[PDB]
């Protein structure tokens, strides 16, 4: 069954082994699906990132195809570019754009973002989501760990390992997929859901950018889930810090009823996003500049 799955992946990946053109693999990070390494392109000295995912260690292997579908089909300015995929032993390797500024997580855990920076991040994320959603793709893992930065403060959406597609023939998804504290209540309720779940998850990320962490982050994941499902929309710990404009924006995101929650395309017109600064405004938040 593992051997069966290897053979199958082999038919859809690029042939060969990128070890032949890459040097100095250095681990920089982990996920539940696998690790991330940087590597040097031998011929040129350029840097790339390489995601390595062991086929035997997945919750659900079939999700590994998401990596290949998104690469083949759904590219954009605010989406991490995937270059090639290979089967190397028992691992799927994906060679992709290196986002040398790291993940938004390191920022929200160590500094305070102002609203211009928050708005720039939301704007960038929402542009990527408007396009993904309009083509049937739901990310399902929106949180600060999935948002990556360039050295000059450009924002890109990453980690498509958990995504799903919808369409006329399959309008909703039913799988329990995401990270507990960021999951939409309808998803936790096991209701059929759509792209709207990404919008709730973004709201929780806005909570991360204002508070440093999502709500109920001290509760075990299952208790946190229960509270998300049953209670009113979670509140910012320091609501007193945010402008009325940020709060009105957040109120369009953290809406329990998915039918009433704003869409990505709606949100792109919200006056909060008029505060968005340029990428340069994000630059000082990064570890190498703080």
């Amino acid at each position: 069954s593992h051997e069966q799955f290897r053979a199958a992946l082999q038919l859809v990946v690029d042939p060969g082994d990128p070890r032949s053109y890459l040097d100095n693999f250095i681990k920089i990070g982990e996920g539940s699906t696998g690790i991330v390494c940087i590597a040097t392109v031998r011929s040129s000295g350029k840097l790339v990132a390489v995601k390595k995912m062991d086929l035997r260690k997945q919750q659900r292997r079939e999700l590994l195809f998401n990596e290949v579908v998104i690469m083949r089909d759904y590219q954009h300015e605010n989406v991490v570019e995937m270059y090639n995929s290979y089967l190397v032993g028992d691992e799927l390797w994906v060679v992709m754009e290196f986002l040398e500024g790291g993940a938004l997580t390191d920022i929200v855990t160590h500094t305070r973002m102002n609203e211009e920076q928050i708005a720039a991040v939301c704007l960038a994320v929402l542009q990527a989501l408007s396009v993904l959603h309009a083509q049937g793709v739901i990310h399902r893992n929106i949180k600060s760990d999935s948002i990556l930065l360039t050295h000059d403060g450009r924002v890109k959406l990453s980690d498509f390992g958990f995504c799903a597609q919808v369409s006329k023939e399959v309008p909703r998804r039913k799988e329990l997929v995401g990270t507990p504290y960021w999951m939409a209540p309808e998803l936790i309720s096991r209701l059929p859901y759509g792209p709207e779940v990404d919008i709730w998850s973004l709201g929780i990320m806005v909570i991360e950018m204002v508070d440093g962490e999502p709500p109920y982050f001290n509760e075990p994941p299952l208790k946190a889930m229960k509270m998300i499902r049953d209670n009113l929309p979670p509140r910012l710990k320091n609501l007193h810090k945010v402008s009325p404009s940020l709060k009105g924006f957040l109120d369009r995101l953290l809406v329990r009823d998915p039918a009433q929650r704003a869409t990505a395309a709606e949100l792109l017109k919200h006056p909060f996003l008029a505060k968005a600064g340029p990428p340069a405004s994000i630059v000082p938040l990064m570890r190498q500049n703080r």
Partner: peptide
């Protein structure tokens, strides 16, 4: 608690 790990099915 404080888990950043994902859940599938």
């Amino acid at each position: 608690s404080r888990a950043r790990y994902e859940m599938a099915s």
